[PDB]
């Protein structure tokens, strides 16, 4: 009962330690080690892929450094693979069926530790910037799964990868009442934000910053402000440890597999035969149920993607060019106590707070009787209007849209206001509150949740779109209350009862 | 690399040979051009060639008023114009093109055809 | 014409999570008009008009 | 309002118990202490009013 | 002068190749088709890649089309990797070439063919609108692309005036599957799966008791796999489309792909002076392939030949194909229903095919008891709380919108 | 529009009224006086004001909805409780009725 | 035919500024995944080369005091900050299928 195993490896020392691990796992049932070099070119790897498949006794292939032009052939023959040096999340789609049971996580799984940062903090003023990529989109859906249970502050910020364009986009992020920044992009976009946030002073006091691992490189390290807390995967480079553990897992698998029925070996050679070798996925099912008690990298176990079961995370703080290792994340167990945290504002403590503003934007539409949009005077002021008792009625600036007429979006008009609820807000701001800002909506609609035609999106329009997008903060309007608007938006007590 | 050879003053309806010495690369796989710079700085076209000698292309208004020949061994392109009117008094540039190649990577200095 | 704008409301103290359920259920009940029929069963007089 | 509560108990799928007010009327506050249904619910029984 | 290969694997009609091949329809524009014929018999994708590399794809031919007769899936990956490394176009014609519907990155090319699954979902609604019959249940397997057309069709019904409803979408892959199939009360069960999956589910659903007479199934051809078999368990009178390539045969699809290559070549060469040369070695180019940001799919996506705009999407799905709707038979594997061609539905007899509960009711319109409106011009059907009329065209399908007291 | 879409019993008339729908209320306000328009549907808060103010219109009662005018904020704001407390405070002095007079 | 035009064709700003130069045309040319215009810049008389290939792709031996963006029918270039050797005329080129489409030219000086 001798079983061959291929392993696409870079140097011969790897193939030597592969052969020695085969002889060590031959303690139980015999094994066999064939040596596969790592090809420098893609089509040459697709050339030499099935010259090793002449030996049909290969039942698993280890790969290393993209391994795209070789992983498809193994999933085409349903061979269980291990992608050892994979930090790419495109293979995490297991609907391709050219994937593997996971080693160390590709990139996005550190965001679970980012969700466990609120176990230290319980912060709920958190802004997220995503570079627009599929791996970023997978991290988006990962965070949306992580939130469903709080730190439920702000939706998203989008970013187009390939341009600089930070300040023109994210100048709004200076104003959005929150201090927690989470970066998820490439290292070059990280340096672009680093220099633009240096231009915008967005890495000052209060501003706490959270990054991942692949943003941390020397180009970004020159531009990283001293105080950023960074992550690092335990055993990112000890490849031979993952080699020997992979030999022990496949030896556990073939230990279970040599006590089974209907072996039905692959064809010798890649071709000249059928390609629907049926015990392929069943061996992957056995590898899915295969476990590992303990290794040099620890206890290797498998999640639904096969992922590594509290992959430990060394955490560093860049303090005066030196990444001071803050301590070890181990799942439920936290970075305990040992090292002092320097924060990016010269601070020594965690900023437990945010900036509740005394300036909020109250945007609404024109509605007689409660709103009479009046044209301003020659100096832009208001005509002094009296009551029936001669009392000066409060005319505040209802800053209009760029329309004087719908279809001429040019006349950004001051249009100081006149109406019933104007004095109500004057009463409330006298009693409790602040110096407001007032805008008038362009389309003038209440707005319904109309279906956008872009593969099943449904977006609120009008003021409901504006408040949901954060363009407005308080909506005073003669608007009724249905369940539909109440599905997402908090309503106050109903002031004027009507029919 | 590229240097426009010739130009000068031409009469109304006259013919002129426009040459350009090329030093640095081969012709039979590479791609060049001929563009026009007016004194009013309106960027126009003179000659469109192939990357291998091959065929050529004619801009529409100047079509039939010039011909192109590529002597690939001696690395100097030739361009014999004809029927030059008053609206061809412009500085002409020879420029090597890209591998795409509708951009240009290298340039000649510029001849002056009056 | 009356001298107040008041409203009866169901009360649960501190209403942990269930406030979100009950208020949308009330807006659902107002969203169908059976409340108006309940007024025809209960809250209709003869001598006003 | 009983049938309203019946629709609410069908919508949010809750059962109940129908206990009655025995002391006080509606929550008249006496030395800072409510009687009635308000003093009932402020006795933290997770009551419903 | 465009070196073109046409490549097949078995069952060739070489005289239709010799005949189609009309130079006068390529009437001296800029190019002439330098055509070469390859025939194979391989189940050998490795030697398929290697000898084609060894062929004039490295030496002479810059563009090639390819046909099959099988049901293979990895031909998609073979397409994707040659698109990944080589700007030379390969196209899909028949067999496991047009059965390739696979999502990909922004590629250099695609096995361009007829319809999509989104076009099949739409015509499935158009048939359920025309043949007055109502979907309420779908089932799917873990095939990538299941949920988009599901969310499409359900949201499309949500914007119409009259409305289909939905019992359940069953994302599936323990024989209590029959108990989840017990909850399906719709006359229509739509399904996304494979042919071996379909035959297994046909054993399961006939073990439920929801067989071919009561609750009829509706597939696309990808679920049917090969359109020329009843493997084990196909129930009578099921519904499917691929299908106009069956009306094509060989030399119509030869005239399709050849003229598309020659036209789109003259699309580029209409004002461009030349065409990029084929690279001398496929697996050792590695410097010359980056010379061309290719971008000729601007000219490949918009090609019209003989007044037929063979226009694709970004994923090479044809925007204007023809759809032939076909029923099964108790004894045969497919017979007929009718056809579909770009928002034009042509079906046979306007009679729901069947195998007493129904009663033919004769009546006269008299308001307020009977009110006959016409159908809506946007859809062609009746609204909510209205029923279809049947009045003799003096075919009898003048169908109007009856209602009333 | 939401209420007449979700109630399928008058959905025929909801399809009929879809064909002549308006952008602002001030159009239908002028259009009733234009006398090309039989009836318009609106909340009574603006309708009984315009009946009181300009002239020459009536209403037939029959308050179908019976709703109020709350204030829209984003969810989990720190500005719900004290704001609605001030709503009560504005009710508990008649100042609401004062602005009603004015 | 598509026609590129440049704006503003003549200006002069001081040192260390955001010198933004826009270019307009008729039809959208930048569609699939690459943008389409090659910014040329050179002094009067001398041909300094291309500086931007498609939208921001810098060439060999270029400064870092400029950038280029834009899409649809409106691309632009932004010099920031402003150098002292900025007495040159700047040019636009994406052609078409249709042989070659050129823009005008933007001559810039340094305020002093």
mmCIF file with all atom_site columns, C-alpha atoms in Angstrom, chain C residues 18-37:
data_model
loop_
_atom_site.group_PDB
_atom_site.id
_atom_site.type_symbol
_atom_site.label_atom_id
_atom_site.label_alt_id
_atom_site.label_comp_id
_atom_site.label_asym_id
_atom_site.label_entity_id
_atom_site.label_seq_id
_atom_site.pdbx_PDB_ins_code
_atom_site.Cartn_x
_atom_site.Cartn_y
_atom_site.Cartn_z
_atom_site.occupancy
_atom_site.B_iso_or_equiv
_atom_site.pdbx_formal_charge
_atom_site.auth_seq_id
_atom_site.auth_comp_id
_atom_site.auth_asym_id
_atom_site.auth_atom_id
_atom_site.pdbx_PDB_model_num
ATOM 1  C CA . UNK C 1 18 ? -39.706 44.361 21.343 1.00 0.00 ? 18 UNK C CA 1
ATOM 2  C CA . UNK C 1 19 ? -40.341 48.088 20.870 1.00 0.00 ? 19 UNK C CA 1
ATOM 3  C CA . UNK C 1 20 ? -39.048 47.775 17.307 1.00 0.00 ? 20 UNK C CA 1
ATOM 4  C CA . UNK C 1 21 ? -41.346 44.813 16.730 1.00 0.00 ? 21 UNK C CA 1
ATOM 5  C CA . UNK C 1 22 ? -44.491 46.345 18.194 1.00 0.00 ? 22 UNK C CA 1
ATOM 6  C CA . UNK C 1 23 ? -44.217 49.719 16.514 1.00 0.00 ? 23 UNK C CA 1
ATOM 7  C CA . UNK C 1 24 ? -43.858 48.269 13.035 1.00 0.00 ? 24 UNK C CA 1
ATOM 8  C CA . UNK C 1 25 ? -46.745 45.949 13.889 1.00 0.00 ? 25 UNK C CA 1
ATOM 9  C CA . UNK C 1 26 ? -48.855 49.007 14.768 1.00 0.00 ? 26 UNK C CA 1
ATOM 10 C CA . UNK C 1 27 ? -47.889 50.691 11.492 1.00 0.00 ? 27 UNK C CA 1
ATOM 11 C CA . UNK C 1 28 ? -48.773 47.405 9.790  1.00 0.00 ? 28 UNK C CA 1
ATOM 12 C CA . UNK C 1 29 ? -52.185 47.483 11.471 1.00 0.00 ? 29 UNK C CA 1
ATOM 13 C CA . UNK C 1 30 ? -52.717 51.069 10.377 1.00 0.00 ? 30 UNK C CA 1
ATOM 14 C CA . UNK C 1 31 ? -51.420 50.053 6.932  1.00 0.00 ? 31 UNK C CA 1
ATOM 15 C CA . UNK C 1 32 ? -54.471 47.876 6.205  1.00 0.00 ? 32 UNK C CA 1
ATOM 16 C CA . UNK C 1 33 ? -57.479 49.848 7.563  1.00 0.00 ? 33 UNK C CA 1
ATOM 17 C CA . UNK C 1 34 ? -58.996 47.113 9.741  1.00 0.00 ? 34 UNK C CA 1
ATOM 18 C CA . UNK C 1 35 ? -58.568 49.622 12.583 1.00 0.00 ? 35 UNK C CA 1
ATOM 19 C CA . UNK C 1 36 ? -61.242 51.684 10.820 1.00 0.00 ? 36 UNK C CA 1
ATOM 20 C CA . UNK C 1 37 ? -63.505 48.660 10.777 1.00 0.00 ? 37 UNK C CA 1
#
